[PDB]
Amino acid sequence: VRPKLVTIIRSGVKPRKAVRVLLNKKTAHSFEQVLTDITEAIKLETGVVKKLYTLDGKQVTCLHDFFGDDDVFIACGP
Amino acid sequence: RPKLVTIIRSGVKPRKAVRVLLNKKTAHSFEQVLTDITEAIKLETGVVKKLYTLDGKQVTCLHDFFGDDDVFIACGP
């Protein structure tokens, strides 16, 4: 036997980025566990938030900017 | 008094607000706030409930999964 490298496409989600999960026919002892593994892999591909911007394009760089008047912000990853 | 912040993820579709509840006192650093938002985003990523082949058949068991196809589509709730 050999492990299987599956490619997962998230329904409706853009940009179109493949999520790869390695599953073993003799390890995955449950279909629900496969779904959990896929769920974790999707969560892992979430880029960590590195920057924040106001709607008008100013970078939010400190706690003071963050607790001002605006309560809507744009998050950018890497 | 806690602040309810709406985060919009850049370039991500569909357009779904991520809300984070933050307190000016409890938030110790700006990095802490970025981490709490990152965690909030990962949480709102729905748990995968159904899988489908490209052609439209639901994959519902281990045997369907270890067939010949190796590309699938995930659906949440």
């Binding site: - | 439209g56 589509i73 659906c75």
Partner: peptide
């Protein structure tokens, strides 16, 4: 262009 989902 192939197209499918859901």
């Amino acid at each position: 262009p192939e197209s499918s989902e859901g």
